[PDB]
């Protein structure tokens, strides 16, 4: 018999940092099912930051705003099941970086939907608006750049 | 310069630069000049092979990979210099070590050609233990498989038109055989056929056929989501000179992590399912992993960064808090 | 019977076992090895492989005196009848951080506890005594016992073997593939008549060839404390030890080159190559590897004199035998 | 095709010694077909001190003298062929160490021969003489303790 461990939103088990010499703090230690458990839905908690990259560990509970963005973006579900709803902005943003509210209603034409189970990735095209669908709570990664709704809180999320 | 097969082993010989390279039943010899006579070094075949296998594979990339405590590279960008002692304390304190630099195409084709000639059928350097059959032995065959694994560049995601297959066409790994083979649903409104991309990323790694080799799954700008599945020991300890983020996907690794002159260790890393981190610059690292697991790894494929660490600008480590 | 050990785990089926504040279990790759410092468990991961072989060398060596080391965490240091156990305390960095661990133990323990995670451990496809290319993989669930390993019967060597109150010869081992070009014709002896029986020659060649195990001396003559202990030779000694006591290596066939370092921190000292031939002082202060490609025959020339290992750091006497 | 490399003495490769620290006399290294090739038949040449015990390379060519001993002794031949003859001494060594000259013609009944080729092994009994007989050059190496026989010459065969 074979057992693969996923973690869940309702069952983890974080790691260990033992040092034997330097500091905790410099490897950034965190868990996201941990921070997806402890913040508000689709809140973008950054959880890596590389060089203005980032990657965001969102808490899929319900419906999300419109999000734009002017580059790709990848999402994988980790936990759950998000649908992903897509539009065709008529008037895409050129130049920016990072993720953006694409407002209370846009201006595009649907282009359909597409259903995200646990492990499965799925591109976020530049100048589309994205929205997420989960039913229960989920977990997202959003690889993508810093931006305007980007959170930051080491300090509560990190090993120090 | 290879020479032709010995007589009693099988295997050939070859020369890079002043280093003569080696191999029997048991172990990959490598042979080089200081303070006069000829220097040697053994490594048991079936960790050389390994070794070897990731540095090709890696394309050199740019970083320390060290093979023992002793044999090594430094791999410069188009050059890299094979070292043997060198960053071995006692060793050039003694100042019978040895480093020369090469053309990247050199040693990368000079190594492809001495893991073409002594992976025998029976071996597989891509694989665990578990996996494969023994390095061991007079020589024997090629691995064909192997050597017919063509590489193909994630551009920006794989599944795409113009861009690297996901793997429907691979075994599910043994040790993953309880992953689900589902695909996401894809439904693209009227006149947006095709426009939609996605799939199992967990399929994906589930049917990899190596081990210890990230390969591009998402690309955003630098931005580079290389994932792996990990098994057994990774065949050298490395370390780049760039920050890489570590997120692990399911089971777990256990990762040790030492300054990279003298090795000193300074932590021991255990990472379970969904645990995140950053390796910091400074530090080389080797990791240990019980179960097939699969491991993210997050680059950033600016190319200014690695000469970036070295001017003041940049620290090792990420983020202060 | 003071062994401490678990029940069979349910998914690999391996035991795991406790030696004081030591506790010692295995997965389908490693070995581990956990303890406590700080106030806050340690532990280090070692290829089953790797650790079994280490593991069987010390309980065939009966522990005997100086260090024996499985890596640069993990070995014994035994005294005696006594033996530490260590984990990174003759390491540099683990020393000085404050993270390793000692603990004493009696030796019938430690070597009770040994062979219990041997028979446990080491599974029907594999010989913690082989060399690679002889036995199988050390590694997955549990399955089976090695009776050929458990079933091999330990008879000292009182004068000299083939006598007849004394350790048998070999006639009765397959000859190891490897010295299939040894030569198995036996010394002629033409005892005078009233003295059938008290002249004594063997084949030692014919003797080793048949050697079904590796990196393990086994005495062959004793005159007096002078103990010649032969061996036969393959792929890498199994653990880096070395003795408190001068040895002298004697290659008595093919080639074996030895890793030679400082007792303390490993500062090579020496890369000696030893072909057919060599004469050698393996001095006192220091440990050794050994690593050999083809299957040899060395002589090992042991003092069994009690008092020397103490009489090495007594100011009398000098690490290295000769000075010349 | 198996090779087991036994050298002899019109054929062997001395080893080497790698120092990267200390010095190459602390290791005493000989070989013994070069040191049996340059001492003169039976002079028992020390190659292996250990605290008063010895490992002699005698050089067998022709007849040696009647060696005694208060205590055990063995022999192994390295190379070629030898006779041992053994005496069964009226008045044995009971006292003393080390190999001694049983003189020119000894008091005994003969116990017979034994026949040596390459990588046999003999014991030379407490309190009996014994003599060696080779056609042939060939290497002898006996286990005993330094005795009046016993040449030492470190700085000629071994590496400094």
């Known amino acids: ?160 | 310069q290879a020479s032709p097969p010995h007589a009693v082993t099988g295997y050939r010989s070859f020369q890079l630069g002043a280093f003569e390279l080696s191999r029997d039943e048991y172990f990959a010899r490598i042979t080089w000049p200081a303070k006069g006579e000829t220097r040697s070094h053994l490594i048991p075949a079936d960790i050389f092979l390994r070794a070897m296998m990731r540095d090709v594979a890696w394309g050199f990339f740019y970083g320390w990979v060290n093979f023992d405590h002793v044999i090594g590279t430094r791999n410069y960008y188009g050059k890299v210099d094979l070292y043997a002692g060198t960053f071995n304390g006692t060793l050039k304190a003694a100042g019978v070590n040895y480093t020369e630099n090469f053309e990247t195409p050199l040693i990368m084709a000079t190594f492809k050609a001495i893991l073409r000639d002594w992976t025998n059928a029976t071996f597989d350097p891509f694989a665990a233990p578990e996996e494969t059959g023994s390095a061991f032995g007079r020589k024997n065959g090629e691995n064909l498989e192997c050597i017919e694994r063509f590489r193909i560049a994630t551009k920006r995601m794989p599944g795409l038109q113009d861009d690297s297959p996901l793997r429907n066409d691979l075994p599910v790994n043994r040790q993953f055989a309880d992953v689900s083979q589902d695909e996401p649903e894809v439904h693209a409104a009227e006149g947006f056929e095709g426009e939609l991309h996605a799939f199992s990323l967990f399929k994906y790694l589930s049917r990899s056929d190596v081990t210890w080799n990230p390969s591009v799954t998402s690309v955003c700008k630098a931005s580079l989501f290389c994932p792996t599945t990990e098994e057994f020991i990774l065949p050298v300890f490395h370390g780049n000179d760039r920050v890489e983020w570590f997120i692990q996907m399911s089971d777990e690794i256990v990762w040790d992590v030492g300054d990279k002159d003298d090795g000193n260790p300074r932590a021991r890393i255990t990472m379970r399912a969904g645990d995140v981190c950053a390796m910091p610059a400074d530090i080389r690292h080797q990791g240990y992993s019980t179960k097939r697991s699969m491991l993210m790894v997050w680059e950033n494929a600016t190319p200014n960064l690695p000469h970036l660490y070295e001017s003041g600008e940049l620290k090792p480590y990420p983020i202060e808090f």
């Open chain 1, 1 to 160: 018999a074979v057992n693969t461990v996923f973690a869940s939103l309702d069952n983890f088990r974080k790691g260990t940092v033992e040092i034997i010499s330097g500091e905790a703090r410099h490897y950034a230690f965190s868990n996201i099912f941990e921070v997806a458990q402890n913040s508000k839905p689709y809140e973008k908690v950054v959880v890596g930051l590389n060089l203005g990259y980032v990657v965001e560990t969102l808490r899929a509970e319900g419906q999300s705003p419109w999000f734009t963005a002017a580059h790709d973006e990848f999402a994988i579900v980790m936990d759950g099941e998000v649908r992903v709803e897509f539009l065709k902005l008529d008037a895409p943003s050129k130049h920016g970086e990072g993720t953006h509210l694409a407002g209370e209603l846009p201006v595009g034409k649907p282009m359909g939907y597409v259903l995200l189970k646990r492990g499965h990735q799925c591109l976020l095209p530049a100048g589309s608006a994205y929205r997420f669908e989960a039913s229960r709570p989920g977990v997202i990664l959003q690889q993508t750049i810093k931006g305007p709704l980007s959170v930051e809180k080491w300090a509560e999320i990190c090993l120090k």
